[model samples]
Target: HHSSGLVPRGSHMPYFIQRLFNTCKSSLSPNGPVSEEALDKVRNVLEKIKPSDVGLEQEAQLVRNWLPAIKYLQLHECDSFSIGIFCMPPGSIIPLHNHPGMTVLSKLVYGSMHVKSYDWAEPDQSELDDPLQARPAKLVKDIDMTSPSPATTLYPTTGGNIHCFKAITHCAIFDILSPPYSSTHGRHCNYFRKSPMLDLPGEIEVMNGEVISNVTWLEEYQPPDNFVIWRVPYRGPVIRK
Candidate 1:
């Protein structure tokens, strides 16, 4: 068989994610050795998700259409993994946040989002001495995404583990959060605000149309007052028991 053998065209959503669940249990980092085959499988399923697969077909009709708040449609969540979707309207911003001890895969099923992401910078001895002070981080990515884009991956420490999103247009993000967030085990989501890196000894650069040094001080902060995320029923294919 050529072109389509073994790899079924339009594989079933539940079956694909079921493979993801089993593969993540053993192959994800912060655990045992990662297999190349496992990564390819994960990447394949992440890209397979679509707006219509998750019941957002109606919303995709109007490029400018928006919801009152960021809507989260959770398809599945367990101790090992979680699958969900976040639909953001134009101009809405999910402020910069960190994924503590986790790997995330995000696919844009439709529309576009301006993404800003960073990695923690190696600290000076003085900065490392105080755990309560702002941590220094280097900007890694400040770009935008649209539908028909390849899925992006972020590991526990790299590939822009700390990131934010600003909707460039009405958009939906299908996300895979392995070993999902748990405050009890210290894998909790934390938000941050950027402070000036007064001593950064490099040429400043511009991103998101704002002048920013390569490195910036990141201080843990309360989420913005108007920021809200409300849950809605999931109508997509189910994989969780």
Candidate 2:
């Protein structure tokens, strides 16, 4: 079930939510494709979310608003494609990273976040030796904001799809759209460890101001990491079996 007031407008939400509730219990194939209608509906739903509605003042307020949206936007495998939401506790930071051939829609509902977008200039031949230093990368843009309306949009073709996110305040959550999470017709979500920023090379020890640096260290993360991913269950009363 979705959070109260978290519906993706009358136009969206219903179809995706209905399908997700009905099908999640079944086994999912590794290769699945999300419907075009689902993608468009998500766009409409995201367009309606705003930062001011939650009254974000401190970090707690930010997390409070973030979870609801995430609960409503669940991640499921369909046609080898997967779509889901990621929520970060206040002060939690998503290190610099990249997704290969994944289209994403990120919107902040409660607090602000610092975003750094990167590009893959060349392949890292040393990827086998040191994945972090395997290839050459470039910085495309550095953005800092406090819950801007309509959220930030990124495309794999234009942005190289490599970026990082740091919570400017507290809790943060956003939506993601990836068709066939793995390789399907030559599309997949490939994760990479980020190279250190030359100008400011080091882990972000502290966030002194509103937003921090654009460059980040994409260290290798293991399972049982700090953040946990859970599949939300459907709780609404059933009208049909």
Candidate 3:
């Protein structure tokens, strides 16, 4: 497990985790308004912990140990965006998927990572066209391509964003959720496969809906089976803040 014992006393670790646990108890609601107080509290906690404070090796260990709690905290928060740490064993790759009403802020804590974000675009439409309309046409296109930037402090901040992560070496990350995880509010973990409809005139069509249960299944997805109806089963501990 990633070691957090190195965290100094009076740091933000304990308080952050406490609030996370508090939020986890409540059912996640999309309309569940964002608590400015809670958001400020968590953000404050994050501010105290600098990326360089934790050594790469130690950061990896910290990530592994904190993943469970982080996942729990995220779900309880019922955030519009998903946030949690990811440890990519060497050579592992997180599949391609887009956030629904969501944006992600990923920060690599240890090791090295490679990431690519794809924009869903229709082939026939110009950059000026509306994405929602082109998507029904089933054309998954890449836009504004970016190579993996150093994991040091790079984080994404936009909704309906699509991206993939791969471990250049063994890697660990601290992902931040704007809110957190909540099942009922459609904040569940979801996976998707790139549509195989060949080159058409529309945006990419994702098959499976959001998968709200099973920590193991999050970020794990593939293509080739067009017929499978993806389902996310809810199975996580519950608490109310």
Per candidate, the number of residue pairs that clash is 0, 13, 19
Tens-digit per-residue lDDT, 130-233, candidate 1: 53466667789998887878999887778998999988788888887865888987788988887554764543434345444566778878888778788999
TM-score of each model, in listed order: 0.78, 0.53, 0.45
TM-score order of candidates, top first: 1, 2, 3
RMSD after CA superposition, every candidate: 6.7, 11.0, 12.5
- Per-residue lDDT tens digits for candidate 2, residues 31-97, read 2214445545555555554333222234345454652122333444455435444455545555455
Candidate 3's TM-score: 0.45
True-structure RMSD for candidate 3? 12.5
lDDT for each residue of candidate 3 in 16-75, tens digit (9 for 90 to 100): 434444442232224322554544444444444333333234445544453111111122
How well does candidate 1 score on lDDT at residue 198?
71
Q: What lDDT does each candidate get?
A: 0.74, 0.48, 0.40
Instruction: Indicate the residue-level lDDT of 95 in model 1.
Output: 86
